[PDB]
Amino acid sequence: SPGIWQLDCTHLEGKVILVAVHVASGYIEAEVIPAETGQETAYFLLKLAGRWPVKTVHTDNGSNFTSTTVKAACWWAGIKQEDGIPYNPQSQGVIESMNKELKKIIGQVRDQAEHLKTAVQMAVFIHNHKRKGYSAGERIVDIIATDIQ
Amino acid sequence: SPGIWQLDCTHLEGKVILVAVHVASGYIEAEVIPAETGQETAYFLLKLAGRWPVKTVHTDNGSNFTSTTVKAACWWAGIKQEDGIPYNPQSQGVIESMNKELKKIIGQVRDQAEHLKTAVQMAVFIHNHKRKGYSAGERIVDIIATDIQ
C-alpha cells in the first residue's frame, strides 16, 4: 500500500485532466492534456514514478491497460500495471466525489489563471494541503517514510 | 531545512531544462521548456509546491527573482522567494556537477525516447532512485516526515 496508485481521467473545458491518486493517502498529481492517449498516459506515469516510489498502478480504462506505450513506460519505470476494476464498489464513489471536488475548486480559482492547466495545479495544491488532522501531503510522506524504516 | 529548494536552468538540444533541487536531500524535479521565462518558471513552482511543502525557493537568476509573475506564483503558493547567490561557494560546484551528471544520463537514455522531455524524466527517475545507503527520494521523505513529527 505505500506504492499503490490509481489513474483517473476527467473532462473540463473540452480538455482532459489526468489524475494519479495515491490510494492510501488521497494525495494526487494531475495534468491537462488535449485528449487521453496511451502516449500521454505513459509520459505521465514516467513523471510520477521519478517523483514517488510507484509499485503498482491501477489503470483508468482498458485502452490504457492494453496500450503498448503504457506497458513500455511501466516496464521502464518498474511499475506493475494492473486493471482499475472497482472490486470494492465504494471506489467508483470515492473517485467520482474527488472529480466533483476538484472541478469545484477549479471553478473557484479559474479566474485567477489564464490557462486551465494553472487552475488545475492550484486545485492540486489546495487538495493536497487541506487538513481533515493531517493533509494528504502529510499522510503520503508519513506512509512512505514508515515503509522505508 | 525541509522546505528549501533551489532553481537551476541548463540547456540541451536548443531547449531549456528547468530543475528544482531540494537542497537537503538532492532530490530533483525537472521540465523541458522552449526558453526560460517568468511565466514558465512561475507555473513550474506552482506544480512543485502542490507536490512538496515548499517554504523557500532560491531563484536561479535575477530575471526570475524580479519577475512579477514568479512573485505572484510564490505569493499564491505561500513560498518565500529568495535570491540564489552562492554565499557558500561550494554551491556553484554542486549545481554544475549535477547538471553535468544529468546531461550524461540524458545522453545514456536519449535513444530510448522520441522526445527530449521523456529522456529528462528518465534522468530525473535515475537521479532520484540512485543509492549512495539511501537515495535522494528516500532522504527527502525521511526529512519531511521527521519535520511533520
Binding site: 505513459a42 509520459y43 514516467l46 503498448t68 513500455a72 | 530510448q112
Partner: peptide, 8 residues
C-alpha cells in the same frame, strides 16, 4: 516508433 514514449 519503438520508443518508450511512442511504441509505434
Amino acid at each position: 516508433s519503438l520508443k518508450i514514449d511512442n511504441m509505434d
